[PDB]
Subunit: 319 residues, 3 copies
């Protein structure tokens, strides 16, 4: 009697919870192979200047990680030569030539001290003279904002995962002969397979301000989750998109994202460059995937564990 | 009697299957630390032009992901200025100046509309005038094929994995004083430790056409699997190379791989650029590794589980 | 009696080892989401030349993988044209025009053979003439060492991990209003949250020589481990930094790390370039993370397994 009832209870528990909920009856491959091919579109304008994708999207190869430049501090006509050192560099400020010694090379400085003391770019102060790429950015840079139309920029993310154990492959764009991808807007439900995202949409879904992230910069992750149950039709294994900032926002020291790159020229045989400090939004496309398909081995093993505890549950009910 | 036979059967099952097949007696580290150092070699020629690795391999730092450019659509002598808008842009075509309004900036366009209507690059049509990088690519581009000798290109992939738990490190190139790496060709068996692959070989092993992948572009994965059994000599833990396309081929919208980059110049003090749209093959080197080494803890734990079910198997044989 | 003692022993074993040591009572997420924002600082000087971060740090976007150039072999004034082929290329050396045939394009060569035989850059030898980027590097390159002050370079690594299951996020820089990050030096204990590392410090902690790694090049991994116990205060989940070389050092063929990039100019309307072969140290920032937080489900399941073997341990003590 109670032995039979205990049998029924222990069985029901095992069957239902373990198999139907923990999916103990399926072999699982956590971590697929993914390809991410990103393409940004959108043009923005500064003072008498039109910026295109080639200028703000760095790197340009169209991969999982890329930065959209929203603000630049550019120093033009830089050449090897002597110029006053940045006033922000330690021991820069000087009152006479005796206050600067020749040959010091601060790692945080902008060149090799010449031993002299020259007037600063903006008087009346004076700073130690250095040899290097001149003029220095902190005395000759001009700032441009090119993120006025960045929220209207778009980012097509092409993702294709693979499960080698299960030989399953699925992408995030459907095979449609119509011009869907040319006239579609991503939606979690209606347009899940239109992976074209507005930058403003991504920023909002991450709960951030576009003014703050366009001024200081930062990193937003585009997370794609493929939680696939391969015992069901492939129409069931769809992408899940999540947008969240990956860099700190409450920490003033670690908040922001900027980098420096230069464009090199040759004017009258002399190598000149334009140094650009770029504050922008780094977009990181993170792809997570877990797939499970029914296999007889896990089934038999976990059924054996189920019968095993059924037994002990019965013998303790006696004991 | 039958209790003894049941004991023998249950034991044999546990010992053989669990330990000898599931490797329950080994602690396993899934996912090593890998370094991938790729170097492409090969020169290809266009009309009165020889292309080298620096031109087609982008990025050039020699990492796990890189693109080999097989076809380019290059627009030369681009400068900020006014030019007819691409006829492919919406609302571009115009019949009089009244049909174009000043100040509109389409994100999918190529600049800021001037309010005028000018003759197109190829008559007799007319398109709205825009300010931006001019002339636009869709009216001044010239196409070059530089993949004629890409199948003969070679890709040296240097891989070195590490298992921190097991303090095991192995690379895919052997310590040989002879000039093996200068005269060797990869083979799955005879030359497994000559990781120099022809691009045509990679493309064929992926089951793709080099004409199709040289015209549209795409992504091929070079997957290296290190399934190491560290209870055996290190000579046993070798790489396994797999080649397969990672981007869709049956989906016209998501099929292909292209990117745009530019070369910037300064002619008479004016910043001019050459815009290049590059169709190429992206090579992705994916490294998978699983290692196991015998440990006493898993051994004792799984032996305890083995004896545990031996028991229940015996008590149910009674019951 | 002995049944009671056996009960006590089996229980103590299960409780202590399994829960208190194996953490069977916690759900665990292996592998977080991490953002790495690297910024190198430091200037180095060659013969009448000051190198800055923009010149040696490639790529410059500030990511997990980047290379610091310590030595360059630069070939200047390269243009499409005819020049002697490198003597190191097979079948290059020639004694008369009949020894070179027109049209051959060696993949390991530097251009298309013209059919002629011209004097080499350094006599008295002669080599087959080729068309391509000329002059070739092996006959016109000049070597510069720019790693004299690389050990004094610094690398700020900003890391922020996330556990989506546990909704936990922590970074490696603390929220301090003082100028700590401007005056701090990393220390495993006192300054764990000052993620600014000297390159020499990284190289030493990897057990390498800076002379050897500055001459040949190589790859050093900066591994950050976040082993977090989320049942404890967040002040307990701190980073663990490990430095180790990822590329082989005992294998002459696979030892080193170099890449080629070029700077393109236009002199008198002709596209000229400077080809640079860069030997440098590739810094790879690898982030590992494992987190566990107490959950009732694993607790009940593993407690059931504990009682299960307690039983069998008891029935075998009888049997
Ligand atoms: N960032 C984007 N926003 C909106 N639409 C895009 C974006 N990137 C690409 N597309 C469109 O979606 C399709 C996929 O782009 P893809 O690069 O594969 O083809 P394409 O037509 O060669 O690209 P392009 O638009 O540069 O010519 C193309 O039709 C393209 O116009
Ligand atoms: N893509 C490739 N195909 C064939 N052989 C290669 C390739 N890349 C490198 N090698 C050869 O294999 C060895 C490894 O190249 P590595 O870059 O480590 O040394 P290297 O001699 O300095 O390279 P390089 O050939 O540019 O001088 C070198 O001898 C090089 O000639
Ligand atoms: N490699 C480095 N070595 C030492 N200090 C650094 C390094 N990189 C950045 N810092 C300092 O630590 C802080 C973090 O740098 P971050 O780029 O976030 O801000 P920043 O002040 O805009 O950088 P920058 O120093 O280029 O102006 C800044 O105060 C910066 O001066
Ligand atoms: C440079 O800085 C140090 C430390 O503050 C200071 O002692 C020294 O006097 C400074 N240099 C000169 C020439 O004043
Ligand atoms: C995109 O542009 C429209 C105007 O065409 C504007 O209303 C909208 O706010 C823009 N998107 C932003 C800024 O999020
Ligand atoms: C621009 O496109 C819209 C939508 O097709 C159309 O209504 C409008 O008339 C077009 N512009 C002009 C000036 O025709
Ligand atoms: C490589 O070149 C040879 C001729 O030297 C040619 O026969 C072969 O087909 C090429 N490889 C390709 C195109 O796969
Ligand atoms: C080119 O190399 C091959 C192989 O060594 C050799 O047989 C041939 O004679 C060489 N070319 C000439 C013209 O000598
Ligand atoms: C950094 O510079 C100091 C001198 O200012 C020198 O003593 C030290 O050795 C350098 N770091 C190196 C080379 O590791």
């Amino acid at each position: 009697v109670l032995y039979r009832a205990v049998q029924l209870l222990i069985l029901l528990y095992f069957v239902w919870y373990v198999f139907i909920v923990q999916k103990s009856y399926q072999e699982s491959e956590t971590g697929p192979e993914s390809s991410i091919i990103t393409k940004v579109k959108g043009i923005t304008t500064s003072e008498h200047k039109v910026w295109d994708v080639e200028e703000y999207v760095k790197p340009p190869e169209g991969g999982s990680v890329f930065s959209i430049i929203t603000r630049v501090e550019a120093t033009h006509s830089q050449t090897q030569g002597t110029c006053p050192e940045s006033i922000r560099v330690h021991n820069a400020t000087c009152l006479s030539d005796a206050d600067c010694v020749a040959g010091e090379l601060d790692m945080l400085g902008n060149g090799l001290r010449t031993g002299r003391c020259v007037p600063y770019y903006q008087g009346p102060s004076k700073t130690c003279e250095v040899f290097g790429w001149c003029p220095v950015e902190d005395g000759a840079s001009v700032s441009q904002f090119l993120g006025t139309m960045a929220p209207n920029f778009t980012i097509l993310i092409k993702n294709s995962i693979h499960y080698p154990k299960f030989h399953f492959s699925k992408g995030n764009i459907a095979d449609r002969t119509d011009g869907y991808l040319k006239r579609c807007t991503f939606h979690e439900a209606s347009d899940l397979y239109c992976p074209i995202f507005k930058l403003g949409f991504i920023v909002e879904k991450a709960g951030e301000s576009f003014t703050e992230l366009a001024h200081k910069g930062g990193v937003i992750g585009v997370i794609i989750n493929w939680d696939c149950d391969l015992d069901l039709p492939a129409s069931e294994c769809n992408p899940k998109y999540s947008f969240r900032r990956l860099d700190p926002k409450h920490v003033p020291a670690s908040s922001g994202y900027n980098f420096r790159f230069a464009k090199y020229y040759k004017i009258n045989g002399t190598t000149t460059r334009t140094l650009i400090k770029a504050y922008g939004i780094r977009i990181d496309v993170i792809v997570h995937g877990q797939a499970g398909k029914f296999s007889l081995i896990p089934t038999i093993i976990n059924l054996a564990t189920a019968l095993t505890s059924v037994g002990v549950g019965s013998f303790l009910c006696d004991w």
